[PDB]
Design a binder for this molecule. Structure first.
Ligand SMILES: *[C@@H]1O[C@H](CO)[C@@H](O)[C@H](O[C@@H]2O[C@H](CO)[C@@H](O)[C@H](O)[C@H]2NC(C)=O)[C@H]1NC(C)=O
Ligand SMILES: *[C@@H]1O[C@H](CO)[C@@H](O)[C@H](O[C@@H]2O[C@H](CO)[C@@H](O)[C@H](O)[C@H]2NC(C)=O)[C@H]1NC(C)=O
Ligand SMILES: *[C@@H]1O[C@H](CO)[C@@H](O)[C@H](O[C@@H]2O[C@H](CO)[C@@H](O)[C@H](O)[C@H]2NC(C)=O)[C@H]1NC(C)=O
Ligand SMILES: *[C@@H]1O[C@H](CO)[C@@H](O)[C@H](O[C@@H]2O[C@H](CO)[C@@H](O)[C@H](O)[C@H]2NC(C)=O)[C@H]1NC(C)=O
Ligand SMILES: *[C@@H]1O[C@H](CO)[C@@H](O)[C@H](O)[C@H]1NC(C)=O
Ligand SMILES: *[C@@H]1O[C@H](CO)[C@@H](O)[C@H](O)[C@H]1NC(C)=O
Ligand SMILES: *[C@@H]1O[C@H](CO)[C@@H](O)[C@H](O)[C@H]1NC(C)=O
Ligand SMILES: *[C@@H]1O[C@H](CO)[C@@H](O)[C@H](O)[C@H]1NC(C)=O
Ligand SMILES: *[C@@H]1O[C@H](CO)[C@@H](O)[C@H](O)[C@H]1NC(C)=O
Ligand SMILES: *[C@@H]1O[C@H](CO)[C@@H](O)[C@H](O)[C@H]1NC(C)=O
Ligand SMILES: *[C@@H]1O[C@H](CO)[C@@H](O)[C@H](O)[C@H]1NC(C)=O
Ligand SMILES: *[C@@H]1O[C@H](CO)[C@@H](O)[C@H](O)[C@H]1NC(C)=O
Ligand SMILES: *[C@@H]1O[C@H](CO)[C@@H](O)[C@H](O)[C@H]1NC(C)=O
Ligand code: NA
Ligand code: NA
Lengths: 452, 452, 452, 452
């Protein structure tokens, strides 16, 4: 534990980034249309408040060496986009790289940190995603990467404008060890893709290689979760591990795959940044993003990432030879416990645990192991495909259907025993007894345990 | 071999640390009540003399930048705690981190070494445990970690007050190579836990990964012993490998597990720091901590860590799939040999060795291989559960029961053939013959060999 | 993506280097005789335009510390060789090492970069191959190797003469990450040899060890391709991965082995540098080097290295126990796709794929997966052994037989639907259908897919 | 290739070091008695000319900070020992460490290089073995270790006295890459021990881990040879890989084990430093050290370490589970080839090769593969146990029995077809035919091939 370095990131950030679905094809209009949609779907008031403009936004630098926004894409400048966002209670995120160029080859901020931070503050930006392309050999040890990322941390501080600082160096040089003192979150892997298990030659480090020398990209969901597993102990209030944008509503993930993915990102206290096109978002994916019960886990006050209790490889493997099952467990601020039974195997299987496994650091005879716990299904009462379809088609309003965190914070809701934040009680677990469930292929049993 | 850098640590340190059982809930009263108990149990006069106050003791820094003790927890200042300790023939240990913050998020000493060392000397501290949380990217190579730890070594020297300097950087950047010239001991792994074999996702480096890039914590007893195995050659008089505080009397280790753990920590010349709550210590655990014969191994003059002679995996595995058997052997200053037959398997098994294996660096026809050796059981004559229970319940005194090392040092005792320091002769081993014993699951046969 | 650092290497370089076949036995006469032959074979006008003089060319340094060409080997100086080359529309490459000495022990350029770059510019050199022998400990981290290679990059820039800068540090210290900002290409492995699969003790890093600490040499074709596989994502316009000179026409590779080797080097956008003796080049090898269709892949505008889609080990292993099969796929600027079915096994086998695998980053229902694609065999219409033998024996001219890229660029040819650049249409692949072929041992099916 | 940095080490050094058999118990008398014995046994005139005094020779430093020889062990100073050695045509070696202390805890030379080099030159020393104990964190990257070893290289040069500079840093930080420009030889592993295969917990890096982070010691013969295998390419005239002192005549190696060990150290161009006590040396070991034919391999002019052609694990394993077979081959300056068939398995086995395997870098149809080669057994005509026993017992003189390299160099002897340097012709190997032999357990077939 340490205080937040800048007072921000007291819980992981939530929002949306245009990259997965728009790439370099960005504009003021795109950003504001999306923001309007995120507001109208009631997703903004669930906490998805950072509208993060990614790469390809600039056209070069002026005679003073200042970044210039592309005037075709942003005819009114960036500050004007910020103003529209702020006027609808959004926060505005922008992008650069700690290199000569950005990943798409636009002007990068390496050695230009003071001017570039100043540009972002002049344009009323609230968040910076800060990449690792073209870093001119300034990597390879913790100390060199730390000083490069600190250069922009300090420059942003110098502006006097609070900026949520999001590192994007893919875990390179053990970022989880040094991120907290200079940043609010850090990517800890190469880019995720809409694949649950698929090994990819562009992502050469497997799930056990958390200290990876070629982060790459097109890393699968499970590859990234596995990399993140040991890293929870180095995250907490003010500084989070970042498992990359959610692929919910992107590509061809099954409903089970999307539930597993959203639930596990929540449970490890990853940022929850929508990667989908919200104006081209299907019903099942929308109700995943809108599951208040799961977001409440992610937004637990004094948040602690959950711990992987066990992992076993199974003979039920998919088309790519992949198949493993995992149990995760983690404390919650009100005294409850989050439990995940994760079936990464190719077939539906029964999955089981006990209080001894769930309360993994509790001694025999402790009050946690001696007590009875009520099991709540965190996926109960999800917005059904019909209501979701109605809301997306603008025939129904999200107001009164989705939980409004702006009106009543997750903390306050949990205190008042709000049904929408706990899911449904489905039973109880006593000492000596076992919790048994059937878990779909590439799916999850996601529970909140409460003292009876 | 090299001289002790500061004249201290001529044998490994012994004492107690409040962390395992009290965490941040510390006070003067806790410290003095515990110290009184350690004195009264006769554990102080066995050599357990460092009372080490861990994290969470400070409240901030004053207008001069000096550390301030929490005045609620320490109403009289730290120097007053030291005075009480010294008046009962104890030594006083304190804690900081070579980082911006301590592990629990209190003020750290990085870049503040001169003031902080001065604070400790002003408060009459005799020992510093010096952590590795929040190190601001100052790790990753031997040279950078060495200079950070040297900064505090030098600062402590500058005060003129002798301070036993205990490194806590978890082996990071090959500490065993550089610790000796600037420190008296160094942690060589992530934190131990009360588990004999259990792999843990928070401790991602297995037993063979001595050069680990994510030390983590909740590492099992065997995981840490295995990591330590190759490191014995880089320890000795003045500078020791530190396998973390003893879990004897903590959690739910079996009696065999606690004997194996205490015996192996002694045998590799780890510090022997009680991790138990001494005012909530069970009988079997108390008599483990009080085994004079085993402490005498640890406190051998001109101490040499023992060497692992062999390791084999066995089919008898526990609930976590773990099972291995090991033989260790090491020289003792008086010419005797310590031998350990370690059964990490899940079932009781017969275990065997010969003089050739025991005296692993002796040539055929050498006088060690040609001679007959008397076998002594170092666990013979342990304080029985009844006497231990009586002493702990304050119905019997430890005086005249436990060995008094203050009255007569371990060195002197061994010279005078003191029965309490050798255990019981159980037989002899001749050339060509084999030593056979039955060793309990997760247990040990721990012997001292003497020339007949 | 980033712009070319110096405006060169817009596509990978093509040419010839004397090393494989002449070693230190070089002279003006050798160079000009070879160049005449490369011109007359029509290989120059296919794009093989860099005549690269390798090691052993100098005799020492003069009283000013300037490099001196060996006056026995180069009686007229180097600039005179350049002039002859330029007068036949060739470009001239030379060699040094970023060390005290070159690999063969001649004067190296480390700490002498300004003078040596000046020497090369004074002698009208167009290309520098820059080795990594005898680097005086200046390696081990990205930052140190980057600064050493940057020293010569800057020195060459200072001369004002455009020089194509080719790194030869064998991938050491993750060159693919830092090469682009200071160089046009970088060797990414130890030296290739004329072996398709053979493990060699002089090349201790296997195919999966892309981050290798002892690059070595005598690395097999497949060893180097495997190392290169994850690296494609860090290559592109202006800066390429270099898989070493082609062994086509060197040693005893089969015709299938040479086709696989040439096709895969083309497909990953490696430089295509002839390693053969062109005055001692056999017919089958000549027609491999002259396959316009395959060169057009390598010289695709806005070039993207292909991606390895899958790799499986097979039971059909060669004399060295090696056997694997691979599928590669990559985009082409005009919208076509290159597909490679690679049979590294010891026997001829059927090989298969689908549109879903070929278009690996396309979603179900996308227009690429829903469309029908015409399959073109890129090895169709290769110059037959008879015509090749006739041309090599100076009985037939290459004019009107080999494609003339000087007359009409690869880009322009592809636009005009030139038959010589596409191979032969052999069928079509529809959704849901499978592409089936038989692939010879150590051979390849190499296709261009075009929308029907 | 590069020139020798200082003109020395044109072939690997030969001599003797007192450590293995005398440890810290050294004196002038020991050194001169041993030297007299090495002279009288005719071993000096075979090339064993460096008498290397190891650790524990000093008593401290004087008021000027100069090293002081222990006046009890060296009553006349070191220069006087040098004079006696030089007067019997020996060269004198001494020892320090690139650390605060030597390995045995005597004064080390780190930061004292100028004075210490001066001390050695003042005392007429010809050779320095320069250790790596207590290096004060100055390791971990190539650059830091290189600069530490360069500091003493430069200091020795500054004295103006030629000193053969022998590195002893156990291969740490890839010494084979940077040793040549500053030193004549470099240890490339932790200390050898008199075990042919035995894995040891004190030597945690196995045979494949050439880039080892804990070199350790008690490494077996095969462990060290395996580590050395890829390193041959970075050795040659002026700078050699050092596989540690020979264990021939030390401990309990079989005669086959000692022949394999001596032959392989010769063949890879390791230094050949006698580790035995020459006044307590058995007959079989003496005739191993005196095999002129094998020394001639090691002392080949323009020496090239041999290459491991293949390695296979066998089911015939020893008490430690070890068993592998290897073939090595290497060029010799006169055009001959050295071939080793190495049987590391537990039983006698037939071993076979062909000209294609022997001449591993030769193309089919080359003159080496098309020619017939005479096979010479390099172990033929070894001094029999009787003659050896007679010489050692001072009943026979070595003069006229052992080859005298002082009288006639190895180069000259080979030119004159001297029978003593070639062994005995036992047959011939033709194209298409196989060389078949039976090789004893842990033994070797060691051949020189000559064109018929
Ligand atoms: C995944 O594949 C499904 C078919 O299984 C496909 O329908 C999705 O693409 C989306 O299809 C929608 C048709 O109802 C269409 O309206 C939408 O534009 C389209 N999305 C895109 C980006 O083309 C695939 N998943 C996704 C989210 O693309
Ligand atoms: C391990 O579990 C045992 C039961 O097998 C449990 O009794 C121990 O906890 C201790 O129990 C004592 C009851 O006699 C009690 O007096 C003591 O307070 C309690 N310890 C703690 C810290 O709660 C468990 N081991 C330990 C040492 O905690
Ligand atoms: C590979 O081995 C073949 C035999 O299978 C051999 O012929 C090649 O060497 C070349 O042989 C030619 C005979 O027609 C000869 O003219 C040529 O000089 C010779 N090459 C060399 C360098 O000696 C072998 N391959 C190669 C390309 O060397
Ligand atoms: C290895 O073991 C053999 C027995 O197999 C033993 O004899 C050797 O020790 C040497 O024995 C000699 C007896 O003839 C004796 O003269 C000699 O001093 C002794 N060596 C030492 C150092 O004690 C063993 N090998 C060696 C070379 O020690
Ligand atoms: C935002 O609202 C403020 C009123 O609070 C107004 O002054 C400003 O013009 C608005 N900007 C935009 C772009 O809507
Ligand atoms: C700048 O840094 C200081 C911490 O040193 C902090 O108090 C302040 O909030 C920071 N300001 C901004 C704008 O982040
Ligand atoms: C909602 O639709 C998704 C597919 O988009 C499907 O997987 C899931 O089963 C549906 N849930 C319901 C309400 O049946
Ligand atoms: C300080 O260092 C010197 C060694 O240089 C030593 O003599 C002295 O004992 C040290 N003092 C303390 C208080 O540790
Ligand atoms: C002492 O009690 C422990 C349990 O606390 C038990 O394991 C052990 O067997 C007992 N020893 C005796 C004296 O029987
Ligand atoms: C030198 O560098 C600059 C880029 O800073 C570039 O504009 C110019 O083309 C370079 N000149 C040469 C000769 O490469
Ligand atoms: C051309 O010759 C090569 C051998 O050099 C052979 O492998 C191949 O089959 C031949 N191709 C033709 C035209 O048959
Ligand atoms: C010192 O170094 C130079 C090489 O710079 C060399 O010429 C000379 O021989 C060296 N002298 C000694 C004594 O090694
Ligand atoms: C010489 O003696 C050794 C044992 O010291 C033995 O291994 C070898 O067989 C003997 N050689 C002869 C001449 O038989
Ligand atoms: Na507007
Ligand atoms: Na004398």
């Amino acid at each position: 534990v340490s205080p937040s370095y800048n007072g921000l990131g007291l819980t992981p950030q939530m929002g949306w980034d245009n990259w997965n679905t728009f790439a370099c094809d960005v504009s003021e209009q795109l950003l504001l249309d999306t923001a309007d949609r995120i507001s109208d779907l009631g997703l903004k008031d669930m906490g998805y408040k950072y509208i993060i403009l990614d790469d390809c936004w600039s056209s070069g630098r002026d005679s003073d060496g200042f970044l210039v926004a592309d005037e075709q894409k942003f005819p009114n400048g960036m500050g004007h986009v910020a103003d529209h966002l702020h006027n609808n209670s959004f926060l505005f995120g922008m992008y650069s790289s700690a290199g000569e160029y950005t990943c798409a080859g636009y002007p990068g901020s390496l050695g230009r940190e003071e001017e570039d931070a100043q540009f972002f503050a002049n344009n009323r930006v609230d968040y910076l995603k800060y990449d690792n392309c073209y870093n001119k050999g300034q990597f390879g040890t913790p100390e060199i990467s730390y000083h490069r990322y600190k250069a922009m941390s300090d420059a942003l501080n110098k502006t006097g404008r609070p900026v949520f600082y999001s590192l994007c160096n893919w875990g390179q040089d053990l970022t989880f060890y040094w991120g907290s003192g200079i940043a609010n979150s850090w990517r800890m892997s190469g880019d995720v893709t809409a694949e649950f298990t698929r090994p990819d030659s562009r992502c050469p480090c497997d799930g056990d290689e958390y200290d990876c020398k070629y982060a790459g990209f097109h890393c699968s969901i499970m590859n990234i979760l596995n990399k993140a597993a040991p890293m929870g102990q180095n995250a907490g209030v003010g500084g989070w591990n970042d498992l990359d944008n959610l692929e919910v509503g992107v590509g061809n993930l099954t409903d089970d795959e999307e539930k597993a993915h959203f639930s596990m990102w929540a449970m490890v206290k990853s940022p929850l940044i929508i990667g989908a096109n919200v104006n081209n978002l299907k019903a099942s994916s929308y109700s995943i993003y809108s599951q208040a019960s799961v977001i409440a886990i992610n937004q637990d006050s004094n948040g602690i990432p959950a711990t992987r209790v066990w992992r076993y490889y199974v003979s039920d493997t998919d088309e790519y030879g992949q198949g493993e099952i995992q149990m995760w467990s983690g404390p919650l601020d009100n005294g409850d416990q989050v439990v995940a039974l994760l079936n990464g195997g190719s077939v539906s299987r029964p999955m089981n645990t006990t209080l001894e496994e769930i309360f993994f650091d509790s001694n025999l005879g402790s009050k946690k192991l001696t007590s009875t716990w009520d099991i709540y299904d965190l996926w109960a009462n999800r917005v059904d495909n019909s209501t979701a379809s109605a809301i997306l088609g603008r025939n129904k309003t999200a107001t009164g259907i989705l939980y409004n965190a702006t009106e009543q914070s997750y903390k306050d809701g949990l205190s008042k025993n709000d049904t929408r934040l706990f899911g449904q009680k489905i039973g109880s677990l006593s000492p000596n007894a076992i919790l048994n469930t059937t878990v779909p292929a590439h799916g999850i049993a996601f529970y909140r345990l409460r003292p009876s």
